Coordinates of C-alpha atoms and ligand atoms in Angstrom, one line a residue:
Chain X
X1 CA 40.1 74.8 16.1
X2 CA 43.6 74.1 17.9
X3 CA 45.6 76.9 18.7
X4 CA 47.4 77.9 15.5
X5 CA 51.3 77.2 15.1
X6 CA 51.0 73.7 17.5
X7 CA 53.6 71.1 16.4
X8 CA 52.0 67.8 16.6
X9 CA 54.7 64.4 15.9
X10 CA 52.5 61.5 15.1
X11 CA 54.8 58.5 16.4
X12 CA 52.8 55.6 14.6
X13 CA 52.2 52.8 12.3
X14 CA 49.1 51.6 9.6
X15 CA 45.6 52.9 9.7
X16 CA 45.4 54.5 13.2
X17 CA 48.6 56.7 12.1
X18 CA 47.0 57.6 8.6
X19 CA 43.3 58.3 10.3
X20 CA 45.2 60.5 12.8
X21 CA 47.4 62.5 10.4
X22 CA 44.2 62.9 8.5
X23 CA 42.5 64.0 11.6
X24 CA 45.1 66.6 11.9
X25 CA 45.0 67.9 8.8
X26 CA 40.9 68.6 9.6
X27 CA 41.9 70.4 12.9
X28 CA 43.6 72.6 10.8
X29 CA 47.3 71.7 11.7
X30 CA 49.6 72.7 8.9
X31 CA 51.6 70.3 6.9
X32 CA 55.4 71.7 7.9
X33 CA 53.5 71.6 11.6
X34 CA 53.4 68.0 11.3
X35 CA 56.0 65.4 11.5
X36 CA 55.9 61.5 11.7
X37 CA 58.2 58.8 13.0
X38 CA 57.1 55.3 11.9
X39 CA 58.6 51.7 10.9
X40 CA 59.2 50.8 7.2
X41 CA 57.1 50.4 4.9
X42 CA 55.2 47.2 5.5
X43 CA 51.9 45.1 4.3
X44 CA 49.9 46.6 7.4
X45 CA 51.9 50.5 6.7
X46 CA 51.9 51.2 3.0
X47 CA 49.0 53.6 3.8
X48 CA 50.8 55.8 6.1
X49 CA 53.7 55.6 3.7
X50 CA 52.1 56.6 0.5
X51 CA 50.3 59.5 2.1
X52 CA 53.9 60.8 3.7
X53 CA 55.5 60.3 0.3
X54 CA 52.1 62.1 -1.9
X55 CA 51.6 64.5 0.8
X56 CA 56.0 65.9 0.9
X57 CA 55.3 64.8 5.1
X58 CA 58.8 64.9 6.9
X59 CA 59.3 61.6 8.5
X60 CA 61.7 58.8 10.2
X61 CA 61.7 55.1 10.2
X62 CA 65.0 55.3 12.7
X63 CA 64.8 53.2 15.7
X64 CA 63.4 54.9 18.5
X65 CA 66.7 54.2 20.9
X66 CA 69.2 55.7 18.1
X67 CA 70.5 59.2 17.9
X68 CA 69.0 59.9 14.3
X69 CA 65.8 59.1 16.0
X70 CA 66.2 62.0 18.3
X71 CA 67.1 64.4 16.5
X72 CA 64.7 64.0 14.2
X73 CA 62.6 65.0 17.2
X74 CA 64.5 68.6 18.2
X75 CA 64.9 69.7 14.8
X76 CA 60.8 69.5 14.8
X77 CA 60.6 71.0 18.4
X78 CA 57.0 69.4 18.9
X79 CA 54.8 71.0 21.4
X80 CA 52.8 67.5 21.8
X81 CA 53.5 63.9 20.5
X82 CA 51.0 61.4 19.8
X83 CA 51.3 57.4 19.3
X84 CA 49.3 56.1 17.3
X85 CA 50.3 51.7 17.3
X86 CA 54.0 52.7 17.3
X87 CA 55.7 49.7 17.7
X88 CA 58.8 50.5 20.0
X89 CA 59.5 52.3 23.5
X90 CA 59.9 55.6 23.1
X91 CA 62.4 56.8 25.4
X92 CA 61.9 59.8 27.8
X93 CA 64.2 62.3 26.5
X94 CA 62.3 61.8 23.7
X95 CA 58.9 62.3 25.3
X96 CA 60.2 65.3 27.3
X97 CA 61.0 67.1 24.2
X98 CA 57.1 67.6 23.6
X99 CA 56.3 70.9 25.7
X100 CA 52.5 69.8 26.1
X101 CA 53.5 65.9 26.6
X102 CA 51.9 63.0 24.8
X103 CA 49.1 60.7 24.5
X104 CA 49.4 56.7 23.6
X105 CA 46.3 54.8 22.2
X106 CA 46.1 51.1 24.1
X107 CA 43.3 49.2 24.0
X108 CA 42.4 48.3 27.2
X109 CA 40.8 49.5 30.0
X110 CA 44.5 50.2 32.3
X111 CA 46.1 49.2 34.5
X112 CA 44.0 46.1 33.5
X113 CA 45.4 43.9 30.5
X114 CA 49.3 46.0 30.2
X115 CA 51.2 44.5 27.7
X116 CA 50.2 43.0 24.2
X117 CA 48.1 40.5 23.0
X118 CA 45.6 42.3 24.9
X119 CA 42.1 41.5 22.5
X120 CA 43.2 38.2 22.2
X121 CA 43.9 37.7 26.4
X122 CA 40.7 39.3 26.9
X123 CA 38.6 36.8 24.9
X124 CA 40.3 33.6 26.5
X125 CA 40.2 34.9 30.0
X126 CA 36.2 35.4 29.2
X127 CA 35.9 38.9 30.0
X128 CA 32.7 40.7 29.3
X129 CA 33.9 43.8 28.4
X130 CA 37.4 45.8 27.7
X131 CA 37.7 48.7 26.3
X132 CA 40.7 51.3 25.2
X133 CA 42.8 54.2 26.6
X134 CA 44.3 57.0 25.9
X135 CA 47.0 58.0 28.0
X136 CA 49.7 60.3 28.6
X137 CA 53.2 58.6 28.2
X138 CA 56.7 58.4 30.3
X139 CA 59.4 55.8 30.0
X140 CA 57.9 53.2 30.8
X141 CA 55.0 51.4 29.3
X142 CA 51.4 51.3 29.5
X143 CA 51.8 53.9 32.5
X144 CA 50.7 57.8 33.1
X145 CA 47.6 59.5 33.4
X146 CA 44.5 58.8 31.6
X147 CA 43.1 61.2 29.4
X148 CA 39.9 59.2 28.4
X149 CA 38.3 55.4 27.8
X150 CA 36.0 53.8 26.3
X151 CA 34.3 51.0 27.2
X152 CA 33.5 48.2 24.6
X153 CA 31.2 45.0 25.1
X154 CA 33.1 41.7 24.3
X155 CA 30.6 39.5 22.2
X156 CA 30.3 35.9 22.6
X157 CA 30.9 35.2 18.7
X158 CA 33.9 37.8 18.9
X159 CA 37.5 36.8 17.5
X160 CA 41.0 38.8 18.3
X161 CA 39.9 39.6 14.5
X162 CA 36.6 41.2 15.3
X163 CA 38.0 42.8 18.2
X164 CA 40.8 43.5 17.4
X165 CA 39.4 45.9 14.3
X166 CA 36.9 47.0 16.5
X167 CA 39.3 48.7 18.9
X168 CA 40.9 50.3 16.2
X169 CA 37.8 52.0 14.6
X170 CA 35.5 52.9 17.7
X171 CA 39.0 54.7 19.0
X172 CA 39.5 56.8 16.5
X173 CA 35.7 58.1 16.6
X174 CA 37.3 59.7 19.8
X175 CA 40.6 60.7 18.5
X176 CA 39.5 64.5 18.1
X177 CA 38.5 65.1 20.9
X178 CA 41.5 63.6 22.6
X179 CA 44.1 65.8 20.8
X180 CA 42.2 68.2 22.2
X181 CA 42.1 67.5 25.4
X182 CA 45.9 67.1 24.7
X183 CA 46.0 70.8 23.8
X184 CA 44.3 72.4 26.4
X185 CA 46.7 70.7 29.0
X186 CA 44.2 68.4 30.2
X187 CA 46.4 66.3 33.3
X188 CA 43.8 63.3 32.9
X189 CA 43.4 60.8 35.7
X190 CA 46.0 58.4 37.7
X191 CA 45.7 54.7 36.3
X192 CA 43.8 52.8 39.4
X193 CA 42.6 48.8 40.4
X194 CA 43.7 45.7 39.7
X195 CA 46.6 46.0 37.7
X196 CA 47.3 42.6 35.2
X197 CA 49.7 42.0 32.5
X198 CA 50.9 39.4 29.7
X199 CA 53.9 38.9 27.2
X200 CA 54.8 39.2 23.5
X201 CA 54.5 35.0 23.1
X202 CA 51.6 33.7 21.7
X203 CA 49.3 32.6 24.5
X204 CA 49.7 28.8 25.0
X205 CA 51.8 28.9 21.9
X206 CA 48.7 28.4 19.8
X207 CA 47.8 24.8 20.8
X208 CA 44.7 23.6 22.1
X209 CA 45.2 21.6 25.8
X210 CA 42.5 18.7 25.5
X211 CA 41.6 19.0 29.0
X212 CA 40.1 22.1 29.2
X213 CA 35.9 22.4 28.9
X214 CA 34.4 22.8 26.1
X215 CA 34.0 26.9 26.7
X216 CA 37.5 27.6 27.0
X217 CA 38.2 25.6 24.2
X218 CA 35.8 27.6 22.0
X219 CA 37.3 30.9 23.7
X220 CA 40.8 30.0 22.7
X221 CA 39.7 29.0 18.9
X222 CA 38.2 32.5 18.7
X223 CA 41.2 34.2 20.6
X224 CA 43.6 32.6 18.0
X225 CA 41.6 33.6 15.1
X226 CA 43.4 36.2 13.1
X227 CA 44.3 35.8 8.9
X228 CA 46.4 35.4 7.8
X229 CA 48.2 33.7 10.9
X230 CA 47.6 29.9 11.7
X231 CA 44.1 29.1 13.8
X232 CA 44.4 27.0 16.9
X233 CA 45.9 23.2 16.9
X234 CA 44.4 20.6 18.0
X235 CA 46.8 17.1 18.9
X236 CA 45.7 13.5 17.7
X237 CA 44.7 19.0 13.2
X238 CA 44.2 22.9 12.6
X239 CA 41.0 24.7 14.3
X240 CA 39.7 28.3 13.2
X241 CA 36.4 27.3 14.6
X242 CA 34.4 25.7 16.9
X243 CA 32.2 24.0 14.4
X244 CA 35.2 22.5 12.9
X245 CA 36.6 21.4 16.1
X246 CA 33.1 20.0 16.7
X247 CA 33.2 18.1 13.1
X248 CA 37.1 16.4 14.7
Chain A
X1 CA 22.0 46.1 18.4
X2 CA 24.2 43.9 15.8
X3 CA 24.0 43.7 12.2
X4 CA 22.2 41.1 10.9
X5 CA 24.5 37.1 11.3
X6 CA 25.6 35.7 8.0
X7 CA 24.9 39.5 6.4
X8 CA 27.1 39.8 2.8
X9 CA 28.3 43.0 2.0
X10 CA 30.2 44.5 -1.2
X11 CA 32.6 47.6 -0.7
X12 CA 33.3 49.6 -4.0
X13 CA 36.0 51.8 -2.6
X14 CA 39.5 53.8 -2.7
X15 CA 41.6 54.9 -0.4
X16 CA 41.2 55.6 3.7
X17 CA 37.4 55.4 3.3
X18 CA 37.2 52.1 1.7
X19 CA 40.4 50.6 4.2
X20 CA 38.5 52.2 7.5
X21 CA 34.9 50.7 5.9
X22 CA 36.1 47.2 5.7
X23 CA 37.9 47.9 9.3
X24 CA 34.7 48.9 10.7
X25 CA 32.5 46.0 9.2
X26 CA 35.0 43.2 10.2
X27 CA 35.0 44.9 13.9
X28 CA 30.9 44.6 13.7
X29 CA 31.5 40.7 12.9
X30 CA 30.9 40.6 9.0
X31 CA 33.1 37.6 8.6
X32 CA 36.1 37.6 5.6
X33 CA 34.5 35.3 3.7
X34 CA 31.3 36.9 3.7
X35 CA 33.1 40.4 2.4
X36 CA 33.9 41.6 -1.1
X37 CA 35.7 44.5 -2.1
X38 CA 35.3 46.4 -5.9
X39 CA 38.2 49.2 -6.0
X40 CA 41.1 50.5 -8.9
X41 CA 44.6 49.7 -9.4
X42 CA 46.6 50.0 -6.9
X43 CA 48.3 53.8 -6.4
X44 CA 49.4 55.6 -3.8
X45 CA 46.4 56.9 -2.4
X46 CA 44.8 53.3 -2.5
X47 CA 47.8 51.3 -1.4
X48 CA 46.3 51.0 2.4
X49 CA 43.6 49.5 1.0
X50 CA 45.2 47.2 -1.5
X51 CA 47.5 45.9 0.8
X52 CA 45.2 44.9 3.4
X53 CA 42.6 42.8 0.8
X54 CA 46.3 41.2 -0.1
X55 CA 47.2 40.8 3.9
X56 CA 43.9 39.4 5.2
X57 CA 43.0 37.7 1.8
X58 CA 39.9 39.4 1.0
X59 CA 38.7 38.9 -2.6
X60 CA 38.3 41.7 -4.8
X61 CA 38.6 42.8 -8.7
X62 CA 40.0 46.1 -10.1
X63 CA 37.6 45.6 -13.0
X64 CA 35.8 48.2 -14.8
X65 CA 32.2 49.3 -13.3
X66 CA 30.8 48.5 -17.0
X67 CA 32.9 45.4 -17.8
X68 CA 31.3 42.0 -17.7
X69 CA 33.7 40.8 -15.4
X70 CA 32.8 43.4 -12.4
X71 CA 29.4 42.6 -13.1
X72 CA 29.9 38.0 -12.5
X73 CA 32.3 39.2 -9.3
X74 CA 29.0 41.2 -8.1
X75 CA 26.7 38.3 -9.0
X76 CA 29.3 35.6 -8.2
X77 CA 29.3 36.9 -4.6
X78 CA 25.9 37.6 -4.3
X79 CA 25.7 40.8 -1.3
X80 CA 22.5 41.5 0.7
X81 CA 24.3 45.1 0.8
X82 CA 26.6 47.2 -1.6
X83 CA 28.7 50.1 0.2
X84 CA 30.3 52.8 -2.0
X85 CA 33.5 54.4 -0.2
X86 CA 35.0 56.8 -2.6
X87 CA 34.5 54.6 -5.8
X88 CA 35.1 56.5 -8.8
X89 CA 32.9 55.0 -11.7
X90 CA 29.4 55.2 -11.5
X91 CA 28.3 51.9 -10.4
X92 CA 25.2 50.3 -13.4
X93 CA 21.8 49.9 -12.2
X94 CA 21.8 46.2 -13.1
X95 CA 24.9 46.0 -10.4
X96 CA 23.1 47.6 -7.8
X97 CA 20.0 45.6 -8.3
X98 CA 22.2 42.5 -7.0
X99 CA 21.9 44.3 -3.3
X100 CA 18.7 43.0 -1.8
X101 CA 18.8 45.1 1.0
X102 CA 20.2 48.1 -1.5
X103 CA 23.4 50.7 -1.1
X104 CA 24.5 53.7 -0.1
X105 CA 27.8 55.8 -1.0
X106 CA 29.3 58.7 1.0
X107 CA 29.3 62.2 -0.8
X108 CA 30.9 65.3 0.6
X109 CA 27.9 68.1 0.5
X110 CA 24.4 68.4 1.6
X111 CA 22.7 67.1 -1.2
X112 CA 21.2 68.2 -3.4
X113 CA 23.6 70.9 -2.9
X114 CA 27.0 71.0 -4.6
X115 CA 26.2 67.6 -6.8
X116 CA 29.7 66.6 -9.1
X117 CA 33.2 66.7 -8.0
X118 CA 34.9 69.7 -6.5
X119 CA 32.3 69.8 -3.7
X120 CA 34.7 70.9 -1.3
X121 CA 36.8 74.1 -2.8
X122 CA 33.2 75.1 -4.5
X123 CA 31.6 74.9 -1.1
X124 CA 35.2 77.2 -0.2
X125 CA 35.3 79.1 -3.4
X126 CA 31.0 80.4 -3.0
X127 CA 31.6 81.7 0.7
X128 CA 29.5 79.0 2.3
X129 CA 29.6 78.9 6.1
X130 CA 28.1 75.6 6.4
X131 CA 28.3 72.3 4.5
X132 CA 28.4 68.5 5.7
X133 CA 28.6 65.0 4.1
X134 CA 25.4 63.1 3.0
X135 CA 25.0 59.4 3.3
X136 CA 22.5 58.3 0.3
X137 CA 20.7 54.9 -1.5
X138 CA 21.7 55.0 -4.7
X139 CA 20.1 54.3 -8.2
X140 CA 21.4 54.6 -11.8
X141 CA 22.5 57.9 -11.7
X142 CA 25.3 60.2 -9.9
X143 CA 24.4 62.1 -6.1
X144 CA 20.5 60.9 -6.1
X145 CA 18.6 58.8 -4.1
X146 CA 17.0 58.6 -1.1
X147 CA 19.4 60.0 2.4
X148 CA 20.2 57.9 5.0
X149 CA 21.9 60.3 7.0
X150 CA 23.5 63.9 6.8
X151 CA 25.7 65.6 9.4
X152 CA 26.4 69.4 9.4
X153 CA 30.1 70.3 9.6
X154 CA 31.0 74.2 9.4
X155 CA 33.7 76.2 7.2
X156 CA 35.4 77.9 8.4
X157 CA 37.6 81.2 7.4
X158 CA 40.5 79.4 8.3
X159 CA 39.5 76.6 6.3
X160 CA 41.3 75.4 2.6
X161 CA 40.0 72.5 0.3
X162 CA 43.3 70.6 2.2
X163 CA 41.8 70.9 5.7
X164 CA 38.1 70.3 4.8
X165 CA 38.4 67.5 2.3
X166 CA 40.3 65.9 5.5
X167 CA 38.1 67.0 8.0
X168 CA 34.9 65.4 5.4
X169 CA 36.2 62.4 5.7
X170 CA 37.2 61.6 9.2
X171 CA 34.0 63.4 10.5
X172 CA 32.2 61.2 7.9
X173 CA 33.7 58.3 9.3
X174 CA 32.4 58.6 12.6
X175 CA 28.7 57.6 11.2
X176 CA 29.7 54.8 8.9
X177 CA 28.8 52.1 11.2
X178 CA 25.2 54.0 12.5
X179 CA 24.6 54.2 8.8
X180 CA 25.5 50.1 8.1
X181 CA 22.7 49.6 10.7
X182 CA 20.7 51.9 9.0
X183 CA 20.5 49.6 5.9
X184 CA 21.0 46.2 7.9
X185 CA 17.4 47.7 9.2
X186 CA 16.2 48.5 5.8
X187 CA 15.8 52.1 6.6
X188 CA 14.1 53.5 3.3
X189 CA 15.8 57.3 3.7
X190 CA 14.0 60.6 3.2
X191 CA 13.9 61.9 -0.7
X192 CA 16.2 64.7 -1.1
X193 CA 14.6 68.7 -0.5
X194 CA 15.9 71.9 -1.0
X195 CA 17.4 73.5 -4.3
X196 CA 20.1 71.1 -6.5
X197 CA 23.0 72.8 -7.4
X198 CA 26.1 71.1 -9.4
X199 CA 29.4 71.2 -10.4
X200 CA 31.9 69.5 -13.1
X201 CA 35.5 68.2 -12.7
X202 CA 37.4 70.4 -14.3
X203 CA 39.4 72.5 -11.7
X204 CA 37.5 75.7 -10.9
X205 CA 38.8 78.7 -13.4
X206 CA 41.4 76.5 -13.9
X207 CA 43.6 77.6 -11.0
X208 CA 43.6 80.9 -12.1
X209 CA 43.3 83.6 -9.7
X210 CA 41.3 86.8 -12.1
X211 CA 42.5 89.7 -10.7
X212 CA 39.2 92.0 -11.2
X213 CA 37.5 89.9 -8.3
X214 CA 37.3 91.4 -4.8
X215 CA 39.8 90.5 -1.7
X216 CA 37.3 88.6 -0.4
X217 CA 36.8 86.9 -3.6
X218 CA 40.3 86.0 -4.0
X219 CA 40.9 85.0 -0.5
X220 CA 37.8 82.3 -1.0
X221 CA 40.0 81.1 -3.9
X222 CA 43.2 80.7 -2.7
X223 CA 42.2 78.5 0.0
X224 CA 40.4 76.9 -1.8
X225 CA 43.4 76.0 -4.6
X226 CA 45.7 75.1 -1.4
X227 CA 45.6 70.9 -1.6
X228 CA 49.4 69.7 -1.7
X229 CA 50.7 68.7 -3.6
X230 CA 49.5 70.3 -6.0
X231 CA 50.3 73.7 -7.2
X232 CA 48.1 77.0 -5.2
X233 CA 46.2 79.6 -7.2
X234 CA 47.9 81.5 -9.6
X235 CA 47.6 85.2 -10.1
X236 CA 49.1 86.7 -13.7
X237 CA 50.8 90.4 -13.1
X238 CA 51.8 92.1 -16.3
X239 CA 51.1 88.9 -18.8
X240 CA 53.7 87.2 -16.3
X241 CA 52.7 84.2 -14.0
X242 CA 53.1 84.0 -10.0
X243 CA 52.5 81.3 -7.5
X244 CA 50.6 83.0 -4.3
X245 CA 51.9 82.1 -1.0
X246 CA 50.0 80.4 1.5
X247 CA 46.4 82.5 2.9
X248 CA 48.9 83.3 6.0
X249 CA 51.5 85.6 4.2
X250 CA 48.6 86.6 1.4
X251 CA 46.8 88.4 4.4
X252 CA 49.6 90.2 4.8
Ligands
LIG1 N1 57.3 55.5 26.5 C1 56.4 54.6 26.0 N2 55.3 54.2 26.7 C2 54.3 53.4 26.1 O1 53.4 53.1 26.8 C3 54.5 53.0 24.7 C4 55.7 53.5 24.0 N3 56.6 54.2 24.7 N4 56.0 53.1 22.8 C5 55.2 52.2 22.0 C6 54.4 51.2 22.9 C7 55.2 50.1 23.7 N5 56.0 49.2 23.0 C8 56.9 48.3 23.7 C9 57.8 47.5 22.9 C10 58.7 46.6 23.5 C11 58.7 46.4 24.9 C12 57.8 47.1 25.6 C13 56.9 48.1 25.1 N6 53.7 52.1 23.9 C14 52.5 52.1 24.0 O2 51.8 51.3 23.4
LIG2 N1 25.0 54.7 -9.2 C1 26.0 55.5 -8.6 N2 25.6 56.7 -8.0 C2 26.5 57.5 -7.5 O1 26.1 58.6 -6.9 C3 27.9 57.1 -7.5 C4 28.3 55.9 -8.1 N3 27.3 55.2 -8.7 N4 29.6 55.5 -8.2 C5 30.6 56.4 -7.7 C6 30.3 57.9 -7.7 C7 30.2 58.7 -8.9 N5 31.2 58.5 -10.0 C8 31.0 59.2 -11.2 C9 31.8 58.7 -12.4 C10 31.6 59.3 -13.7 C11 30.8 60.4 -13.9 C12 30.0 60.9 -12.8 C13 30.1 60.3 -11.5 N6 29.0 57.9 -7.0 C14 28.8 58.6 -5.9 O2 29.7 59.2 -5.5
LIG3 N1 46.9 33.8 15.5 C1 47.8 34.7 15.7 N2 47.5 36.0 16.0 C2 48.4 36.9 16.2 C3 49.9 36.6 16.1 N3 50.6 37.7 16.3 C4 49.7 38.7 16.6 N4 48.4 38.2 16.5 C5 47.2 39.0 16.7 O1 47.2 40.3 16.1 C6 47.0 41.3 17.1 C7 47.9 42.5 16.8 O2 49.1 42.1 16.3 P1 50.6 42.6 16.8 O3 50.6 42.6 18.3 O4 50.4 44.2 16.4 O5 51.7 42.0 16.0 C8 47.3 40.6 18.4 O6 46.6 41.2 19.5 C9 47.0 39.2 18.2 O7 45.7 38.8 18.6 C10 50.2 35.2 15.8 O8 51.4 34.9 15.6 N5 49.2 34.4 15.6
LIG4 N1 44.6 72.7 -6.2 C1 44.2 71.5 -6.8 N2 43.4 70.7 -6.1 C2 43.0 69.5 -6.6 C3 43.4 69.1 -8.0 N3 42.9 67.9 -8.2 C4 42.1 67.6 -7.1 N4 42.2 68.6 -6.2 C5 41.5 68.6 -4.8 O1 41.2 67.3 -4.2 C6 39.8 67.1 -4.2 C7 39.4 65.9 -5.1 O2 40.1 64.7 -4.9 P1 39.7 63.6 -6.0 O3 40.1 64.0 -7.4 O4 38.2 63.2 -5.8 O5 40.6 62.4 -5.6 C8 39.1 68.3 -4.7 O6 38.0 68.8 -3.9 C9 40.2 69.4 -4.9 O7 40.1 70.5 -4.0 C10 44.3 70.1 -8.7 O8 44.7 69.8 -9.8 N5 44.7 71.2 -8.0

């Protein structure tokens, strides 16, 4: 099991949140032993919400820079936290309120592909393979020690979508044994190699540059695939596909 | 190895199960279009799940498994493979004849063991050390047909019907997309062995703790009665009705 009377705070948001207080739960951790800070509920967090609300969880939706935020952390006294596609920086007071520390899920192999947009970046820029990891947290983001990765092949008919839902799933099959690690104090590894990062903005705000070959053009279309959001553009009209591109 | 290109798959499904199912089949490049999903109305425990089919517009009905209109939306989309996630009406023959390459559903026991619908405080309440979830083809009728794939998972002492039911399903999880091969493959499964044994939906002695069992008896019992939110086990002392605590303060 885990060592009876742990604290675990799930910071977190949709199914990787609900699949981990689940996982929890399993493990054996008590309901008053669990606490959850999250974001309103949303169209991609009504899960989360509905089992907090049917399950009498305690929880916050405060920002993670405001007091109530916090507090909400020392009256729970966690021993570890874990973050589960929370949304927002998580300050270090915070993080140094958890006795065994934390773990982040982010799904990339670090230091490579910091940041956001990662599974779409990683299908333009034609990689071969990514993967996730989970790491230990301090202020700053997409830093600290790794606890474990996975590696995960990038197919050549892959979309963010695909990949995207993929990273989700094959990371929680490791999610167990993670918190554990988490519990028995595991330090993990230092992050090492070529470090590489990109922003919040959409890459190449969505549109397709005609002067590009024909394989970045299909990599793009495929990296800007994601319902319900708008596909690729093309200038001359919208893209989701190569074969479509191919019929303009 | 990848499941099969253009491969058409129908979810009957609630909750977690059903939302992680579709997750995992759009990850393994089943395309949107080329997924259907069969659940209930929308409540808490199946709002995950509603609201993604909403999000990433995936068609679905709430129909009734016997209604005429489940039955076209089956037909309508036509699936090489049906995939039942927690659904909670038995699904007709006639509907599971649409699959060519056939179904399975995920059931909490080791069937033919603990067939019906308190698998998991049963499997509690009988002083079982050992149980597991079964992956199975199904037919016209409830827990049979042929397994695709069982995993063992143990009880424990500290275990309730909260913690296992949990622990079931994200265990159970873990082999949903090995099992998907399984019947992208057309893997026919091994007919079940072993004594059947089964169990009906109305809650176990309905709640009630009978004080002429042993400690051990009554321990079994409470645990398996712990599921909030819903009420523990209750024990009557002098015609008068208590709650039990929790296991932890009961040992004591
Ligand atoms: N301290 C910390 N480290 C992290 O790596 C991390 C968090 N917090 N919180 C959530 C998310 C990072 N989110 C953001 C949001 C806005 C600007 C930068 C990072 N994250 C990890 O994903
Ligand atoms: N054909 C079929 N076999 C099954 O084993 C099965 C289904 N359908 N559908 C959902 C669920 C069983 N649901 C019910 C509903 C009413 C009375 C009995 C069982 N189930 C499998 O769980
Ligand atoms: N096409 C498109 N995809 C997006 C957009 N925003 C996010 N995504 C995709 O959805 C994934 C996760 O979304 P998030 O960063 O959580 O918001 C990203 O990695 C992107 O690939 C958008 O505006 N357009
Ligand atoms: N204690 C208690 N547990 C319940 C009750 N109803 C369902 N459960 C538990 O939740 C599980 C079934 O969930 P389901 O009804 O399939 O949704 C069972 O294995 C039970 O242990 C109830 O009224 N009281």
């Amino acid at each position: 099991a885990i060592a009876p009377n742990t604290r675990v705070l799930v910071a977190g948001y949709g199914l990787p949140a609900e699949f981990c207080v689940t996982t929890l739960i399993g493990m054996g951790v008590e309901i008053d032993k669990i606490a959850v800070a999250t974001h309103r509920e949303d169209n991609r967090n009504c899960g989360l919400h509905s089992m907090l609300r049917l399950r009498n969880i305690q929880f916050t939706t405060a920002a993670a820079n405001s007091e109530e935020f916090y507090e909400f952390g020392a009256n729970f006294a966690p021993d570890m936290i874990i973050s589960m596609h929370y949304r927002s920086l998580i300050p270090g007071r915070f993080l140094k309120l958890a006795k065994k520390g934390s773990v982040n899920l982010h799904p990339s192999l670090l230091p490579a592909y910091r940041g956001t947009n990662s599974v779409a970046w990683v299908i333009i820029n034609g990689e071969s393979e990514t993967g996730f990891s989970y790491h230990r947290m301090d202020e700053n983001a997409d830093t600290g020690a790794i606890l474990l990765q996975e590696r995960i092949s990038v197919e050549e008919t892959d979309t963010a979508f695909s990949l995207f839902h993929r990273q989700i799933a094959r990371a929680m099959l490791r999610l167990e044994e993670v918190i554990l690690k988490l519990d028995q104090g595991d330090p993990g590894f230092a992050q090492l190699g070529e470090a590489s990062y990109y922003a919040r903005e959409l890459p190449f705000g969505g549109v397709i540059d005609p002067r590009w070959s024909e394989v970045q053009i299909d990599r793009f279309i495929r990296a800007m695939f994601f319902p319900p959001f708008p596909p690729a553009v093309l200038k001359i009209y919208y893209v989701p596909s190569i074969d479509i591109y191919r019929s303009l």
